[PDB]
Design a protein around this ligand. Structure first.
Ligand SMILES: Nc1nc2c(ncn2[C@@H]2O[C@H](COP(=O)(O)OP(=O)(O)O)[C@@H](O)[C@H]2O)c(=O)[nH]1
Ligand SMILES: [Cl-]
Ligand SMILES: [Mg+2]
Length: 343
């Protein structure tokens, strides 16, 4: 009975393309068949190789550098560096055995744990932990494997689908810095903006300059969107994404939010916080602090004729996104009448 046009906005690697993948799983045909699977098997292997070669290459460049725990692995390091830039790598059995032995080296792992000091795809641990699965000749990627796959294709990508007679036309708008000049061109008859944030990347810097904090970049972009003159009446659904990785990072206790956002040291969990069942209170405090950084922007200015709807999301978790998207569906249905509450 209606067609809604939703824009996914957000910095690079925030989760936009992953959300589209979930929409296709839920409302189209997912990753289609063996042809797509097979063609995308190469992306998974290339992620695995990118992960291990990035970690290995970073060891000598960290300050202080990190050495192998077992010097017997030196030839494996050399092999990985040697094939780092081979086009169309063929992934023979020895690649997996060498990658796995390096992944198990405590020095390589120690370098991995300092990955916020270089640029490492978030799916590194996921794929490195299942080398034995991926290396099998009869390996077929699961939907989760394909969701975790990191392929940062620039451009604007679109999906359209119907749910209970309502159409949703969703735009995955590339958000790396050199793509943002194009954002305004997708603002054609927008129902709502979905702004996606990598909540877990508070201790990381962006690829574009290897200097600007990733979460600060997201906050700056959200401020740009929230206060934009041509979005004053367009509400913003905020996906505070990567909640799984955020919880892991908070609980590991090695990278403190307050070293990057000092006001966290004085931050108390709000009284109206609604932690999930089983949630560690340290994670609640972290995720609500990050939420409240965005809500401070949305309450500070630009709040005239639109609302912000925050959600905690895990874009690789299909059931999580089913639930959040259904909440979005209801938010959208309720927007028309809610607009009359505004002054
Ligand atoms: N563990 C986890 N990984 C995520 C989440 N969202 C995205 N990822 C991964 O982050 C990486 C980049 O996501 P992507 O959608 O391609 O980024 P974008 O299109 O540039 O916004 C992919 O490897 C995704 O699998 C999340 O909530 N949890
Ligand atoms: Cl982000
Ligand atoms: Mg993308």
């Amino acid at each position: 009975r209606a067609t809604h046009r939703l824009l996914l906005l957000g910095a690079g690697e925030s989760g936009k393309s992953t959300i589209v993948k979930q929409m296709r799983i839920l409302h189209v045909n997912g990753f289609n068949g063996d042809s797509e699977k097979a063609t995308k098997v190469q992306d998974i292997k290339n992620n695995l190789k990118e992960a291990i070669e990035t970690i290995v290459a970073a060891m000598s460049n960290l300050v202080p550098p990190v050495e192998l725990a077992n010097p017997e692995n030196q030839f494996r390091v050399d092999y990985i560096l040697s094939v780092m830039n081979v086009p169309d790598f063929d992934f023979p059995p020895e690649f997996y055995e060498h990658a796995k032995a390096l992944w198990e080296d405590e020095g390589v792992r120690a370098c991995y744990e300092r990955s916020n000091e270089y640029q490492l795809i978030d799916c590194a641990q996921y794929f490195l932990d299942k080398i034995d699965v991926i290396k099998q000749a009869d390996y077929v990627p699961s939907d989760q494997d394909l969701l975790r796959c990191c392929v940062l294709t620039s451009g604007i990508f679109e999906t359209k689908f119907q749910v209970d007679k309502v159409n949703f036309h969703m735009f995955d708008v590339g958000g790396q810095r050199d793509e943002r000049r194009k954002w305004i061109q997708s603002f054609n008859d927008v129902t709502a903006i979905i702004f996606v944030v990598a909540s877990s990347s508070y201790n990381m810097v962006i690829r574009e300059d290897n200097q600007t904090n990733r979460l600060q970049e997201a906050l700056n972009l959200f401020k740009s969107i929230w206060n934009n003159r041509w979005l004053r009446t367009i509400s913003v659904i905020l996906f505070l994404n990567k909640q799984d990785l955020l919880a892991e990072k908070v609980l590991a206790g090695k990278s403190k939010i307050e070293d990057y956002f000092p006001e966290f040291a004085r931050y108390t969990t709000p009284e109206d916080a609604t932690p999930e069942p089983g949630e560690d209170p340290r994670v609640t405090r972290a995720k609500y602090f990050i939420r409240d950084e965005f809500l401070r922007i949305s309450t500070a200015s630009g709040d005239g004729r639109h609302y912000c709807y925050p959600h905690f999301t895990c874009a690789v978790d299909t059931e999580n996104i089913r639930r959040v998207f259904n909440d979005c569906r209801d938010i959208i249905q309720r927007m028309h009448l809610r607009q009359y509450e505004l002054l």
